[PDB]
């Protein structure tokens, strides 16, 4: 009926870690290769994703216990989940009014058509945008948003993980926190927890579709040469 | 005493190939990650070099006979010589008045200090700038500039080449052309040919120093991650 002292600590450090790795001013975006509207948007969006992967690694390293995993498991979890955390964290710039991601300036406003010009089809972009509006309607508390990112990252059902028992226990503790938080602190959220777990399921499907479309891009060197070294390493298929 | 018909053909196709791969408007530079003046200039300069490597590959493919080499030799020659062709072709933007490369706008004006902020020391930048002013004073004809780039690229004394005999014969024919051109068409150039061959020697020394300093950058992943996939492939040490 009331959040434990250790549960709120988990929340505090997750919230701080998110504020430390998500810049609401988006001022860093000017450093990316500019947008062009072939695949005219592939250079800017590749820089956007690469920058975001660095943020997700920074967030991950501040989840309680993630750092104490082996370096192999840390990589396994990041390589499988990175695109999912990006889709999740991007909800913070998504707008229902424009059905797009608005990152400050109009040059950093990304329509669906912008993403197609980066090598992606409606097969991915249709369910991605539906995922964003539905996640947006949930009206998540900041505490809930960050817990969902952390739960998604700490999934033991990823290819490559070895310490299944440890990762599951971490993820369990995070779900208990989320469930308690919603119960105590979110009025009218008796159905929210289930809805959020459903969004995790949607992310697996978006991940699958993104992986398929990334694969075709990376098999064409005139496109893959536009990617960054971090993108190719993280979304690549090498195994540690 | 007069240029043969086949010698001028070589000149014509080299000149055209250079005009097709060198844009005097520099308008493409706005697509690079912007300059910042750590290694604040490493992203822009890495994009500059990557773009330029593509131009050198385009130039190379139009040298008579280069395309008829094996794909291995073409790569061997490009991997060893690429940085030398870039230093040579950059003379076209170098200015004696500013001791810098001026590519149109002031944001694309590169001082010595700009290059240090990309991870390079005066060990390289001192002889590089001296190389530029001296090559600039030669006042090369366009025909001579392009022949020197082609002779530099077709050197058989590169690590990795296998068809030594073929490449040397190509390079021989190009030197004969250069020697004849200077004799017939360059008044007061009785000493120019030797001077140019000396500049090729200077390029080997700049190449060595650049390779040493590239190596230390590429061993630090926080810097190497800023490079592009083409840079890492061409300046990398993998062997075909």
């Amino acid at each position: 009926h009331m959040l434990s002292d250790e549960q709120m600590q988990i929340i505090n450090s997750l919230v701080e870690a998110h504020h430390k790795t998500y810049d609401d001013s988006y001022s860093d975006f000017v450093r990316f290769r500019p947008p062009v509207r072939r695949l005219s948007m592939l250079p800017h969006l590749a820089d956007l994703v690469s920058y975001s992967i660095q943020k997700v690694i920074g967030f991950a390293k501040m989840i309680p216990g993630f750092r104490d995993l082996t370096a192999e498991d840390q990589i396994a979890l990041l390589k499988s989940s990175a695109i999912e955390i990006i889709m999740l964290r991007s909800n913070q710039s998504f707008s229902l009014e424009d059905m797009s991601w608005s990152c400050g300036g109009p040059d950093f406003k990304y329509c669906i058509n912008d993403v197609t010009k980066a090598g992606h089809t409606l097969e991915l972009l249709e369910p991605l945008v539906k995922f964003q509006v539905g996640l947006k309607k949930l009206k998540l508390h900041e505490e809930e948003h960050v817990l969902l990112m952390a739960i998604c990252l700490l999934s033991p059902d990823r290819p490559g993980v070895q310490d299944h028992v440890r990762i599951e226990a971490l993820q369990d503790r995070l779900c208990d926190v989320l469930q308690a938080y919603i119960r105590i602190q979110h009025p009218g959220g008796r159905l929210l927890y289930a809805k959020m777990i459903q969004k995790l399921a949607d992310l697996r499907s978006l991940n699958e579709e993104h992986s398929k479309q990334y694969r075709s891009l990376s098999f064409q060197p005139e496109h893959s040469m536009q990617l960054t070294p971090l993108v190719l390493e993280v979304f690549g298929s090498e195994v540690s | 005493h007069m240029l043969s018909d086949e010698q001028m053909q070589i000149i014509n196709s080299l000149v055209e190939a250079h005009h097709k791969t060198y844009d005097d408007s520099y308008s493409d530079f706005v697509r690079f990650r912007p300059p910042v003046r750590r290694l604040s200039m490493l992203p822009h300069l890495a994009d500059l070099v990557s773009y330029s490597i593509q131009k050198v590959i385009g130039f190379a493919k139009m040298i008579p006979g280069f395309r008829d080499l094996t794909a291995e030799d073409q790569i061997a020659l490009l991997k060893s010589s690429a940085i030398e062709i870039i230093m040579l072709r950059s003379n076209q933007s170098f200015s004696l008045e500013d001791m810098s490369w001026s590519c149109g706008g002031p944001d694309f004006k590169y001082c010595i200090n700009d290059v240090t902020k990309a991870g390079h020391t005066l060990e390289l930048l001192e002889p590089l700038v001296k190389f530029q002013v001296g090559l600039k004073k030669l006042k090369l004809h366009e025909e001579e500039h392009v022949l020197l780039m082609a002779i530099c690229l077709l050197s058989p004394d590169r690590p990795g080449v296998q068809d030594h005999v073929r490449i040397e014969a190509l390079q021989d024919r190009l030197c004969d052309v250069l020697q004849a051109y200077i004799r017939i068409q360059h008044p007061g150039g009785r000493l120019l040919y030797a001077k140019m061959i000396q500049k090729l020697a200077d390029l080997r020394s700049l190449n060595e120093e650049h390779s040493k300093q590239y190596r230390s950058l590429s061993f630090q992943p926080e810097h190497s991650m800023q490079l592009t996939p083409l840079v890492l492939e061409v300046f990398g040490s993998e062997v075909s």
């Binding site: 990589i75 390493e233 195994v239 540690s240 | 190497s224 991650m225």
Partner: peptide
């Protein structure tokens, strides 16, 4: 393998 990731993971 994963040179950059290792670096980023400290």
């Amino acid at each position: 393998k994963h040179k950059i990731l290792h670096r980023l993971l400290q």
